């Protein structure tokens, strides 16, 4: 009673697989975020009733969020911290590891619980993202590539889209991507100052 259920990555990655800067993002696409709010917040509308989705994230991620956006609001927050001193995120879940984070949350939203938990997302820093791609649930990643080498100090863990794990990792067709999401989601490239991005989803075997 900790594991049945997977794991799904999302992230926006240049095609150097670089993920940030000085402990923020090199870019600012409004749009991608946009993108990223929905699908970490979207739930069928039968479910929407009493389920909500959880965004698992580092605690640097969640100090480089401004306070006006946090919490992530209609989603369940969870904070990954390793010595568990304090933190503060209004009620907000604190763990100190990735299964640390299961357990709890698989004990405080049970079958008691009049609110249930829908998906589980991982969200935030490269440190998590480590631990994700390591985790034997983890069998979908919400990638927005973007076509620009930005210059980046921090990367994403593992390169799944290189020929190396093409046997492993699969990039999904949009309209299985759009059917996951639940909505329709933009396709091909997008022009967010002076870069080229596109949506795409990725999945593997557990
Ligand atoms: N391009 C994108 O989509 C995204 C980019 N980013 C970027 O990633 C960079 C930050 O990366 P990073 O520093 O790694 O961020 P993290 O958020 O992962 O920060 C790591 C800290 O979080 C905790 N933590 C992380 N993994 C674990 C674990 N497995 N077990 C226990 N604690 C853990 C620890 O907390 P403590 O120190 O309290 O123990 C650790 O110090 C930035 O540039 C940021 O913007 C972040 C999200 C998305
Ligand atoms: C560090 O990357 C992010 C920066 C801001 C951010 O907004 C969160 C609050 C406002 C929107 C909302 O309410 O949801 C979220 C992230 C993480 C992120 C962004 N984009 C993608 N593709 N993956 C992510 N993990």
């Not at 870019?27 to 509308?45: A, G």
């Not at 004990?107 to 480590?130: H, P």
């Not at 069998?139 to 980046?152: E, L, S, V, W």
């Amino acid at each position: 009673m900790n594991q049945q259920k997977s794991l799904t990555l999302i992230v926006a990655l240049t095609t150097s697989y670089g993920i940030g800067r000085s402990n923020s993002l090199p870019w600012k696409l409004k749009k991608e975020i946009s993108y990223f709010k929905r699908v970490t917040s979207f739930v069928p509308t039968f479910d929407s009733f009493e389920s909500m989705n959880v965004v698992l994230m580092g605690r640097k991620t969640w100090e480089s969020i401004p306070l006006q956006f946090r919490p992530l609001k209609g989603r369940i927050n969870v904070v990954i911290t390793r010595n568990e001193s304090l933190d503060l995120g209004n009620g907000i879940h604190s763990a100190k590891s990735l299964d640390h984070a299961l357990e709890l949350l698989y004990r405080t939203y049970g079958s008691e619980s009049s609110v249930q938990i829908n998906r589980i997302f991982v969200i935030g820093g490269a440190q998590l993202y480590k631990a994700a791609m390591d985790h034997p649930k983890l069998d979908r990643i919400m990638a927005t590539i973007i076509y620009k080498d930005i210059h980046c100090d921090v990367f994403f863990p593992l390169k799944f889209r290189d020929k190396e794990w093409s046997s492993v990792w699969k990039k999904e067709k949009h309209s299985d991507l759009e059917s996951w999401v639940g909505t329709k989601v933009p396709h091909g490239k997008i022009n967010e100052d002076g870069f080229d991005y596109e949506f795409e989803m990725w999945t593997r075997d557990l």
